Amino acid sequence: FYKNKYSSKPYKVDNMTRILPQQSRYISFIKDDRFVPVRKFKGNNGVVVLRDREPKEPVALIETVRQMKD
Amino acid sequence: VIKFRAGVCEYNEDSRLCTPIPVQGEIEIKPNEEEELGFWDFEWRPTEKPVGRELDPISLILIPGETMWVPIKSSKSGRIFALVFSSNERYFFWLQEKNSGNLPLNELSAKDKEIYNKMIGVLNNSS
Numbered sequence: 001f002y003k004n005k006y007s008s009k010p011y012k013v014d015n016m017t018r019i020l021p022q023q024s025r026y027i028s029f030i031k032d033d034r035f036v037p038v039r040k041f042k043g044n045n046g047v048v049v050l051r052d053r054e055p056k057e058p059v060a061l062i063e064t065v066r067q068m069k070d
Numbered sequence: 071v072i073k074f075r076a077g078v079c080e081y082n083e084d085s086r087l088c089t090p091i092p093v094q095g096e097i098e099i100k101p102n103e104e105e106e107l108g109f110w111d112f113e114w115r116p117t118e119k120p121v122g123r124e125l126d127p128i129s130l131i132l133i134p135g136e137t138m139w140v141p142i143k144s145s146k147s148g149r150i151f152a153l154v155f156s157s158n159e160r161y162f163f164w165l166q167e168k169n170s171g172n173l174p175l176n177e178l179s180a181k182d183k184e185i186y187n188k189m190i191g192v193l194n195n196s197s
Binding site for chain 2 (some may be wrong): 029065068069070
Protein backbone atom coordinates (compact mmCIF):
# COMPACT_ATOMS: atom_id res chain seq x y z
CA PHE A 1 0.00 0.00 0.00
CA TYR A 2 0.74 3.66 -0.30
CA LYS A 3 -1.41 4.27 2.78
CA ASN A 4 -2.81 3.02 6.20
CA LYS A 5 -4.42 5.83 8.24
CA TYR A 6 -2.16 8.70 9.26
CA SER A 7 -3.04 10.49 12.33
CA SER A 8 -3.68 7.12 14.00
CA LYS A 9 -1.96 3.97 15.10
CA PRO A 10 0.44 4.83 18.02
CA TYR A 11 4.06 3.46 18.34
CA LYS A 12 7.28 4.67 19.85
CA VAL A 13 10.41 5.62 17.97
CA ASP A 14 13.85 6.34 19.41
CA ASN A 15 15.52 9.76 18.80
CA MET A 16 18.42 9.84 16.33
CA THR A 17 17.10 6.98 14.06
CA ARG A 18 16.14 7.17 10.41
CA ILE A 19 13.13 9.45 10.42
CA LEU A 20 11.55 9.39 6.89
CA PRO A 21 10.21 12.62 5.46
CA GLN A 22 6.83 10.80 5.33
CA GLN A 23 7.02 10.26 9.16
CA SER A 24 8.41 13.63 10.25
CA ARG A 25 5.05 15.15 10.39
CA TYR A 26 3.84 12.88 13.18
CA ILE A 27 6.65 13.30 15.56
CA SER A 28 4.57 14.10 18.63
CA PHE A 29 6.27 14.90 21.90
CA ILE A 30 5.54 13.19 25.20
CA LYS A 31 5.04 14.85 28.50
CA ASP A 32 6.73 12.20 30.82
CA ASP A 33 10.01 13.67 29.43
CA ARG A 34 10.53 17.45 29.75
CA PHE A 35 11.57 17.52 26.13
CA VAL A 36 9.12 19.50 23.94
CA PRO A 37 10.08 22.31 21.37
CA VAL A 38 9.99 25.83 22.88
CA ARG A 39 7.67 27.01 19.98
CA LYS A 40 5.48 25.17 17.39
CA PHE A 41 7.37 22.41 15.58
CA LYS A 42 8.84 22.70 12.08
CA GLY A 43 6.89 19.76 10.57
CA ASN A 44 10.30 18.52 9.31
CA ASN A 45 13.70 17.06 10.10
CA GLY A 46 16.47 19.05 11.71
CA VAL A 47 18.20 20.20 15.00
CA VAL A 48 15.58 21.45 17.27
CA VAL A 49 15.97 22.59 20.93
CA LEU A 50 14.05 20.62 23.34
CA ARG A 51 13.86 21.88 26.90
CA ASP A 52 15.41 20.03 29.79
CA ARG A 53 14.00 21.24 33.07
CA GLU A 54 15.30 18.44 35.27
CA PRO A 55 19.09 17.52 35.33
CA LYS A 56 18.12 15.32 38.35
CA GLU A 57 16.74 12.92 35.75
CA PRO A 58 19.80 11.83 33.67
CA VAL A 59 18.46 10.50 30.46
CA ALA A 60 20.39 8.36 27.80
CA LEU A 61 22.88 10.40 25.83
CA ILE A 62 24.73 10.11 22.46
CA GLU A 63 28.09 11.88 22.48
CA THR A 64 29.02 14.09 19.54
CA VAL A 65 32.26 13.25 17.67
CA ARG A 66 33.83 16.31 19.44
CA GLN A 67 33.21 14.95 22.95
CA MET A 68 34.36 11.46 22.23
CA LYS A 69 37.68 12.56 20.67
CA ASP A 70 38.22 15.06 23.42
CA VAL B 71 57.52 3.97 28.58
CA ILE B 72 54.48 6.23 27.84
CA LYS B 73 54.55 10.03 27.35
CA PHE B 74 51.61 12.55 27.61
CA ARG B 75 51.45 16.23 27.37
CA ALA B 76 51.08 18.02 30.82
CA GLY B 77 50.54 21.58 32.03
CA VAL B 78 51.44 23.64 35.04
CA CYS B 79 49.14 25.72 37.34
CA GLU B 80 49.63 29.18 38.85
CA TYR B 81 51.49 28.34 42.13
CA ASN B 82 50.46 29.88 45.41
CA GLU B 83 49.76 29.20 49.02
CA ASP B 84 47.34 32.22 49.31
CA SER B 85 44.27 29.94 48.91
CA ARG B 86 45.66 27.58 46.26
CA LEU B 87 43.75 29.14 43.31
CA CYS B 88 45.50 26.77 41.00
CA THR B 89 44.35 28.13 37.74
CA PRO B 90 45.64 25.85 34.65
CA ILE B 91 48.21 27.65 32.53
CA PRO B 92 48.41 25.27 29.65
CA VAL B 93 52.07 25.46 28.41
CA GLN B 94 53.26 22.41 26.50
CA GLY B 95 55.34 20.22 28.80
CA GLU B 96 55.17 16.45 29.20
CA ILE B 97 54.71 13.90 32.03
CA GLU B 98 56.58 10.65 31.66
CA ILE B 99 54.82 7.76 33.47
CA LYS B 100 57.25 5.26 34.80
CA PRO B 101 55.86 1.94 36.20
CA ASN B 102 58.78 0.82 38.47
CA GLU B 103 58.83 -2.41 40.40
CA GLU B 104 58.70 -1.03 43.95
CA GLU B 105 55.70 -1.54 46.29
CA GLU B 106 52.00 -1.96 45.30
CA LEU B 107 50.57 0.76 47.57
CA GLY B 108 51.28 3.39 44.91
CA PHE B 109 54.87 4.27 43.97
CA TRP B 110 55.22 5.92 40.52
CA ASP B 111 57.68 8.59 39.31
CA PHE B 112 56.13 11.49 37.50
CA GLU B 113 58.74 13.37 35.53
CA TRP B 114 57.44 16.88 34.63
CA ARG B 115 59.71 18.92 32.45
CA PRO B 116 58.72 21.71 30.19
CA THR B 117 59.87 20.32 26.83
CA GLU B 118 58.89 23.70 25.37
CA LYS B 119 57.37 26.89 26.72
CA PRO B 120 58.35 27.37 30.39
CA VAL B 121 56.21 30.62 30.55
CA GLY B 122 53.71 30.15 33.38
CA ARG B 123 55.80 29.36 36.44
CA GLU B 124 59.51 29.01 37.20
CA LEU B 125 60.17 25.28 37.03
CA ASP B 126 63.11 23.30 35.84
CA PRO B 127 63.31 19.48 35.04
CA ILE B 128 62.30 17.30 38.04
CA SER B 129 61.23 13.72 38.84
CA LEU B 130 58.81 13.70 41.76
CA ILE B 131 57.89 10.72 43.77
CA LEU B 132 54.63 9.22 44.96
CA ILE B 133 54.33 8.12 48.61
CA PRO B 134 50.59 7.60 49.60
CA GLY B 135 48.42 10.13 51.45
CA GLU B 136 50.80 13.03 50.58
CA THR B 137 49.92 12.72 46.92
CA MET B 138 46.19 13.06 46.60
CA TRP B 139 43.87 13.66 43.68
CA VAL B 140 41.15 16.42 44.06
CA PRO B 141 38.51 16.50 41.17
CA ILE B 142 38.11 20.38 41.31
CA LYS B 143 40.24 22.82 43.32
CA SER B 144 40.03 25.79 40.93
CA SER B 145 36.27 25.95 41.02
CA LYS B 146 35.84 26.20 37.33
CA SER B 147 38.53 23.75 36.19
CA GLY B 148 38.86 20.09 37.13
CA ARG B 149 41.57 17.43 37.16
CA ILE B 150 43.79 19.03 39.81
CA PHE B 151 46.51 16.48 40.87
CA ALA B 152 48.19 17.82 44.11
CA LEU B 153 51.53 16.96 45.63
CA VAL B 154 52.04 18.09 49.17
CA PHE B 155 55.57 18.17 50.83
CA SER B 156 55.04 21.29 52.83
CA SER B 157 56.40 23.84 50.32
CA ASN B 158 59.70 22.12 49.93
CA GLU B 159 58.69 20.58 46.65
CA ARG B 160 54.83 21.16 46.73
CA TYR B 161 53.58 21.63 43.23
CA PHE B 162 50.26 21.42 41.59
CA PHE B 163 49.76 19.77 38.20
CA TRP B 164 46.87 19.37 35.78
CA LEU B 165 47.32 16.85 33.03
CA GLN B 166 46.86 17.51 29.32
CA GLU B 167 45.93 13.97 28.41
CA LYS B 168 44.86 13.53 24.73
CA ASN B 169 42.74 10.45 25.39
CA SER B 170 40.06 12.60 26.96
CA GLY B 171 41.03 16.10 25.64
CA ASN B 172 42.12 19.20 27.47
CA LEU B 173 38.74 20.40 28.62
CA PRO B 174 38.78 22.59 31.86
CA LEU B 175 35.09 22.29 32.98
CA ASN B 176 33.30 21.35 36.06
CA GLU B 177 32.70 17.63 36.29
CA LEU B 178 36.09 16.81 34.71
CA SER B 179 36.47 16.46 30.87
CA ALA B 180 33.71 15.33 28.65
CA LYS B 181 35.28 11.84 28.30
CA ASP B 182 35.06 11.22 32.03
CA LYS B 183 35.81 7.49 32.17
CA GLU B 184 39.45 7.64 31.06
CA ILE B 185 40.14 10.11 33.81
CA TYR B 186 38.41 8.13 36.51
CA ASN B 187 40.27 4.87 35.77
CA LYS B 188 43.81 6.38 35.47
CA MET B 189 43.90 8.65 38.58
CA ILE B 190 42.62 6.07 41.21
CA GLY B 191 44.81 3.29 39.77
CA VAL B 192 48.06 5.27 40.26
CA LEU B 193 47.46 6.46 43.86
CA ASN B 194 46.30 3.08 45.37
CA ASN B 195 48.36 0.52 43.36
CA SER B 196 51.45 0.24 41.37
CA SER B 197 53.02 -2.01 38.76
